Each structure stands twice: as structure tokens, then as C-alpha cells.
Amino acid sequence: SMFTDWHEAAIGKTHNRMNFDCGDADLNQFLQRHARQNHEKGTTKTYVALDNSDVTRIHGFYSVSPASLIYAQVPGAISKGLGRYDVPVFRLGRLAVDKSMQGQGLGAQLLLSAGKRCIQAALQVGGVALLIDAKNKQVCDWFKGFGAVPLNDQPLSLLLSFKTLYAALSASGRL
Amino acid sequence: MFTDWHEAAIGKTHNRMNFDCGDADLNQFLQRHARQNHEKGTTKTYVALDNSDVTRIHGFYSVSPASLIYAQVPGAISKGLGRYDVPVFRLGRLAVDKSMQGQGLGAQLLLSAGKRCIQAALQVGGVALLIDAKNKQVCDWFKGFGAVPLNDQPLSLLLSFKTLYAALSASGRL
Ligand SMILES: CC(=O)SCCNC(=O)CCNC(=O)[C@H](O)C(C)(C)COP(=O)(O)OP(=O)(O)OC[C@H]1O[C@@H](n2cnc3c(N)ncnc32)[C@H](O)[C@@H]1OP(=O)(O)O
Ligand SMILES: CC(=O)SCCNC(=O)CCNC(=O)[C@H](O)C(C)(C)COP(=O)(O)OP(=O)(O)OC[C@H]1O[C@@H](n2cnc3c(N)ncnc32)[C@H](O)[C@@H]1OP(=O)(O)O
């Protein structure tokens, strides 16, 4: 039942950013107004899930950028053995699926794709987790279902460690 | 310019004891932390190895992803009303053995660190190297490559990828 008739690419000028509605105006507007320009500037890189038949149709997207957190915010399961210093991460700044395609596994595939992409980059430049600011309790619970864990004093901000993500990629044959 | 060296990720074969850049904190980092931090993923360290002795470290640098709050970055323009970060890579360490200093190895490793981070940023973002200078002397060294201080921290500098890419493209490295 999982939707797989799509392919991943960097956001580009040919893609239909207007005909996307994930149900959250802020994410729709980011795709419309900011994703492509930010990608070219380098402030955040956005990747789209494109329909295999209509290559202009965006089924979903995610966006990443390098970041860091102070030691006080990081749960000990991640910071154990690292010393009392800033923790390098990648922020998953955006993740969205078009409402017409939701609940079909595309969000899960995109989260794992983002994690794989950041893990690969971290082999060159460092980083140990994805940092996620969840919009609400429901979204927070969605990320917790993949092993993301809340920051120490910010319950809606989560860390999904590359250790957790690597194990999930392994168990699902996605390495 | 000293060029009889090659670059590798820090590993178990390299001689981390026989290295002295004249700064004890940086020697101790190389001895105690560089390799373990590389394997843990908190910072990646790359060494300049003598072409005649693959265990001999002449210099090294270390990098990691980071972010800076808008308020620290000169000229940071916002697309929203809320708090935002400028995505960077920290150049956490840069050092050259005292016997090899003044021969352009530090400059070469700075450009190598910039190249490596620019290439990663093509996948995952980032716009500059962030450098915490040890003192005024080191601060001026980085300023010699166009590094600009943060707004309220004169010893912390940003070296834009715009600057680094121009040099690497001109020299054929990118
Ligand atoms: C960082 C931020 O931007 S936070 C804001 C996040 N974005 C939004 O809230 C925008 C609005 N919502 C959306 O875009 C989407 O609904 C998302 C991204 C939240 C969810 O993605 P969707 O594609 O809608 O749903 P999802 O990918 O969960 O599809 C469910 C399938 O994924 C997989 N899946 C979901 N959760 C799990 C899990 N915990 N473990 C294993 N597999 C899972 C399964 O295959 C599941 O199908 P099944 O439960 O029927 O077997
Ligand atoms: C991030 C941190 O860790 S801050 C702490 C920095 N590290 C230290 O302080 C440790 C102790 N010091 C050192 O390890 C070294 O002395 C360093 C890294 C500071 C300098 O590296 P070195 O290899 O000693 O010096 P450097 O690479 O500048 O050698 C000079 C050559 O570099 C090149 N170079 C240096 N500055 C410039 C410049 N502004 N523009 C162009 N080329 C330059 C030139 O080729 C120059 O040779 P020339 O002036 O004879 O033509």
C-alpha cells in the first residue's frame, strides 16, 4: 500500500510549487516563496518527491540545513560520552506531503531519505542527529514513532539520532 | 609553498604524539580527542601527511555543522519575523607543526576545509565557515583571507563560502 511511484530531486524551476497543499499554510507558503531561492542561496536545501508520470507534480518535500545545540538541551541518550559541549546536528526544517497523498507512507519515506542524506554528509563534515521542531502534539507524536526524543526543556523540539536512523534504514533494507 | 603532503581522515595509523604546533590545547586535542570525535561523528578531522611518511602529521583541521543566531551575523537579512539561524560549518581546529609553519600549509588546509564544507553544503546547506580565533594574531591571520567578525564577538569570524568558492574555482580545485 506504500506509495512508491515517485522519484526524488532537488527543487527546481520546472516543478509545480503552486499546486501543493499539505494542509498547513506555512509549509505551503515556504514551498511557494522560499524553497527554491533558499536552495540556490544555500541556506537550506529542499528535495521534492515528484510523480513518475507527471514530473511537475510535487507529492511532498523536505528541507535540511546544518545546525548545533547547546549541551543543556540534548538528552543524555545522545550526549553520553560526548563531553559537555555543543552537539552538531542537521535541522529537518520542513517536511510535508500533499493532502491528496497523505497516509500512504510518503512522509515516512521522505524522513528516512532526509536522514540518509544527512548521514552521508556527516561522514564528511560531522553531525549526529536530525533536529526537528514539531508543530503540535500530533506531529510530535508522529516523529516520536520513529525514535525521535524531545529536547530537555523544549518538549516540541526533537532529536532523531543517526544511530536510530541508521538502524531503521538497516532493518528496512534502505541503506 | 610546502606541497609534499597528502590529505586523509584521521585514523589509527597516524602519529598523533609527534606533533607540536606550539599550542598545548591543540596538541592535546589531536592526541586525546580528534580520532574518537571523528568516529563518534561530533567533528571530522583531516590530517596533512608527509608524502615520505604516511604516519607523519604536518597539520590538521577539524569541522562540524553549526548554526548562529541571526543577531550575531553582520548583515543577516530575515525572510520572516521570527528567530532564525544562519547555517554554517565550524572550523573548530586548525594547526600546523611548529617546524613547518610559514610555508603555506595552514593556508592550504583552510582552503581544503572550505572546499570540503562547500561540497557537503551542496547536499545539505550551509553558507560559511565559523572560526573562533585564539588571539588577535590568529584573528588577523584569518582576516587576511576575508574572514569578518561577528557583531559582538571580535574574535569569532565568518568566512563566507562565496569567498572560498571563488578561490577554489580559480585554482581549479572546484
Ligand atoms: C519539521 C516540520 O515541518 S513539523 C510539520 C510536519 N508537517 C506537517 O505537519 C504537514 C502536514 N502533514 C503532512 O505533511 C503529513 O501528514 C506528514 C508528513 C505529517 C505524514 O506523512 P504522511 O505521508 O501523511 O503519512 P505516513 O508517511 O505516516 O504514512 C503512514 C505510513 O508510513 C509508515 N509509517 C508511519 N509511521 C510509522 C512508524 N512509526 N513506524 C513505521 N512505519 C511508519 C507506514 O508505512 C504507514 O502506513 P501503515 O501505518 O498503514 O502501515
Ligand atoms: C581555528 C583555530 O583552531 S584558531 C588557532 C589557530 N591555530 C594556531 O594558532 C596554532 C599555531 N599556529 C599554526 O598552526 C599556524 O601558524 C597557522 C595555522 C596559524 C598558520 O599556518 P602556517 O602554515 O604557519 O602559515 P601560512 O599558511 O600563513 O604560511 C604563509 C603562506 O600562506 C599563504 N598565505 C597566508 N596568508 C595569506 C593571505 N592572507 N592571502 C594569501 N595567501 C596567504 C602564502 O602562500 C604565504 O606564503 P608568503 O606570504 O611567503 O607568500
Residue numbers in the entry:
A (entry chain A): 0, 2 to 175
B (entry chain B): 2 to 175
The authors write:
We previously showed that TacT is a Gcn5 N-acetyltransferase (GNAT) toxin that controls Salmonella growth through acetylation of aminoacyl-tRNA molecules. TacT acetylates the primary amine group of the amino acid on charged tRNA molecules, thereby blocking peptide bond formation and protein synthesis. A third-related toxin, TacT3, showing 28.3% of the amino acid identity to TacT, is conserved across serovars.
We obtained the crystal structure of purified TacT3Y143F in 1.5 Å resolution. Similarly to our results with TacT, purified TacT3 forms a dimer with a comparable dimerization interface. The adenine moiety is bent and more engaged in the binding pocket of TacT (and the modelled TacT2) compared to that of TacT3, most likely owing to the bulky side chain of the Trp142 residue present in TacT3. In TacT3, the adenine base of Ac-CoA is further stabilized outside the binding pocket by a hydrogen bond between its amine group and a carbonyl oxygen of the Gly145 residue. It is possible that this different conformation allows rapid unloading of coenzyme A after transfer of the acetyl moiety to the target substrate, increasing the processivity of the enzyme.
